[PDB]
Amino acid sequence: ESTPIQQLLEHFLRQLQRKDPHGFFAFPVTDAIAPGYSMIIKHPMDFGTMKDKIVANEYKSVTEFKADFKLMCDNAMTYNRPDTVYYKLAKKILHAGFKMMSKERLLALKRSMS
Ligand SMILES: CC(=O)c1cc(-c2ccccn2)c2ncccn12
């Protein structure tokens, strides 16, 4: 059922998820687990939602995928205090993805597609 872009995005998503072994970013954050969340965070995102979007072929480019990844991390760093596991893990994931999906890495990949 898959396409080349879907396989590349599944690769990036798997590598990001390895950083979150307990699955704190695996499913949506609800108001039950996080008080007032829907008041503070306008556009929720999580790794499960991203996987579903890849499978449905909703992402046209690495840029569109990268935007959801950063949104997920940015929501966590805005809602949670800096002394929490959620804030610190989000900062770790953000750094990982910026390295993995840099313009330099994407250029090397594009050169290998010749
Ligand atoms: C990602 C996130 O911000 C998050 C995940 C969780 C979470 C999700 C499931 C089980 C345990 N923790 C959470 N709890 C309180 C405040 C914030 N969070």
From Swiss-Prot:
Domain Bromo span(s) in chain numbering: 1-102
Site-annotated residues for Histone H4K5ac H4K8ac and histone H4K5bu H4K8bu binding: 33, 86
Coiled coil region boundaries: none
Location of the region described as Histone H4K5ac H4K8ac and histone H4K5bu H4K8bu binding in the Swiss-Prot/TrEMBL record: 78-80
Domain of life: Eukaryota
Cell compartments where the protein resides: Nucleus
Swiss-Prot/TrEMBL domain comment: The Bromo domain mediates interaction with histones that have acetylated lysine residues at specific positions. Also recognizes and binds histones that are butyrylated.
Function (record text): Plays a role in chromatin remodeling and regulation of transcription. Acts as a chromatin reader that recognizes and binds acylated histones: binds histones that are acetylated and/or butyrylated. Component of SWI/SNF chromatin remodeling subcomplex GBAF that carries out key enzymatic activities, changing chromatin structure by altering DNA-histone contacts within a nucleosome in an ATP-dependent manner. Also orchestrates the RAD51-RAD54 complex formation and thereby plays a role in homologous recombination (HR).
Quaternary data: Binds acetylated histones H3 and H4. Binds butyrylated histone H4. Component of the multiprotein chromatin-remodeling subcomplex SWI/SNF called GBAF, which includes at least BICRA or BICRAL (mutually exclusive), BRD9, SS18, the core BAF subunits, SMARCA2/BRM, SMARCA4/BRG1/BAF190A, ACTL6A/BAF53, SMARCC1/BAF155, and SMARCD1/BAF60A. Interacts (via N-terminal bromodomain) with acetylated RAD54. Interacts (via C-terminus) with RAD51.
Listed name of the protein: Bromodomain-containing protein 9
Gene: BRD9
